[PDB]
């Protein structure tokens, strides 16, 4: 499912992402936009064999186990397939661990590149 901006914002809000660890919700909507374009099914295979899954493009050598990635640390103790669901709960649940583990939102390359130090609330205004 390809969420709508304001649709994803509402779903993330309900899933407790607003001001999570202090990150206003616009951070989460912008990350999701430049990570997966709001497509909960997006997968991107990487040069090291690993693949990025879901709406927040979570990676298989460290966060989830997809079965075809050598050395998967699987830090989220979850299959990668649980992140391609239209129900962002697993993704949101894992995104919290990444963030609460001290990585910050820097863990998302797209956020650090297209959102950090930008007017992120632009991403939720009008919903």
């Amino acid at each position: 499912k390809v969420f709508g901006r304001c649709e994803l914002a509402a779903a993330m809000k309900r899933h407790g992402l607003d001001n999570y660890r202090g990150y206003s919700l616009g951070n989460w909507v912008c990350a999701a936009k430049f990570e997966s374009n709001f497509n909960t099914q997006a997968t991107n295979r990487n040069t090291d064999g690993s693949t990025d899954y879901g709406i927040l493009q979570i990676n298989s050598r460290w966060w989830c186990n997809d079965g075809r990635t050598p050395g998967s640390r699987n830090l989220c103790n979850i299959p990668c397939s649980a992140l391609l669901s239209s129900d962002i709960t697993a993704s949101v649940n894992c995104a919290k661990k990444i963030v609460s583990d001290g990585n910050g939102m820097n863990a998302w390359v797209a956020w650090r590149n297209r959102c950090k130090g930008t007017d992120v609330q632009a991403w939720i205004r009008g919903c």
Partner: nanobody
Amino acid sequence: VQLQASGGGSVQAGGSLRLSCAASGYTIGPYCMGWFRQAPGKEREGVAAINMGGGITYYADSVKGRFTISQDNAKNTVYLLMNSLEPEDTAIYYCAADSTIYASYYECGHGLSTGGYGYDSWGQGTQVTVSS
């Protein structure tokens, strides 16, 4: 966390040297380990990086073809084999790690080529001097 480099010294132009770096005190990671060098009177240069585990490598255009970075795993140990050493390679070599466990795929040579962004943990420098 600790980073302990080894190797370095002096050698004649044309010879080779092998540096090493073991990250210690890590529970998870590092995501990246690489090498930087501060030649006398020049800008700090990002030399080579490797994506821990995944194993992808990146090299500065100067050292491309001559250096080779690899990992022994274990205590997050990596090596830089330096062949065809020229006196221009004389500099202080620093080991560096990026402790962030990225959510999405991050290519380590990204922070290396752009000022060492992301490489938070640094080690002691090791002088390498190429004679002749």
